[PDB]
Structures are given as C-alpha cells and as structure tokens.
Amino acid sequence: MKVYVGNLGTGAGKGELERAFSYYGPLRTVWIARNPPGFAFVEFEDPRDAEDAVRGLDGKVICGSRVRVELSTGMPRRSRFDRPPARRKLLEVLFNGPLEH
C-alpha cells in the first residue's frame, strides 16, 4: 500500500507521522521528502492500516498536528478520480442480468 503524509509546518514531521501511523498500527516503512517544503511518504504493509490511519489522522489532527494524509492507491472515491484504486479483484464472477425477463 502507498501513503502520502505531507504538510509539515507546525512541529509535525517524521516523528509526528511516525507516532501516529505506529499508534494506529505497524506500517511497512516511513520516509520523508526533503525536496518539498513539507511533504513525506509512508508505506503500509496492509491497506486496512492505511485506511484507518489516513482516515484518522486526516479526519482529526494528532496531538495538535494537522498533518495531510492521502492514499495513492486503494482509496475508492466518488470524485473525478482518474487513478484506479485497489479495492478488490472481481474477474472470476460476473452478473449483468442474463435473464431476458
């Protein structure tokens, strides 16, 4: 799973995102982007952990840290999402109303 944790301009960076992500669950790995003014990336071994983490952190600041968390893949939205999210498989089964009534 891919995670995007940016918005580091208020005492919230690697340590902040680290404690948060870790608090929610054991991720795969954490990384920070020095290039940008305040952007970091995180990898979640599992999607569930990312969904709960992102939704939580993004849904509510952490210890006074309004960090910006997002999902690169595996986050189905109703918006004009171009990138195909990884929700399920769906390929072996199919149903579109074979009955002609």
Domain boundaries, the chain: 1-72
Domain 1-72 in this protein, CATH class: alpha beta
User: Which strands, in side-by-side order, build the sheet including 39-43?
Assistant: 29-33, 39-43, 2-6, 68-71
- Residue 13 burial by Cβ neighbours in a 10 Å radius (0-12, 13-18, 19+): middle
Amino acid at 61: V
Q: Are 43 and 27 in contact (CB under 8 A)?
A: yes
Token reading at 101: 């009534």
Token reading at 22: 């870790």
Q: Are 5 and 48 in contact (CB under 8 A)?
A: no
Q: How far, in Å, are 10, 20, 44, 96 from residue 63 at the CA level?
A: 11, 9, 21, 49
Question: Which run of H or of E encompasses 54?
Answer: helix 47-59
Token reading at 97: 């109303």
Chain discontinuities in the chain, listed by preceding residue (C to N exceeding 2.5 Å): none
Token reading at 92: 């072996």
Strands 29-33 and 68-71, sheet pairing: unpaired
Token reading at 7: 């918005």
Distance CA 101, CA 54 (A): 45
Distance CA 26, CA 92 (A): 32
Task: Report the length, in residues, of the chain.
Answer: 101
Distance CA 30, CA 3 (A): 9
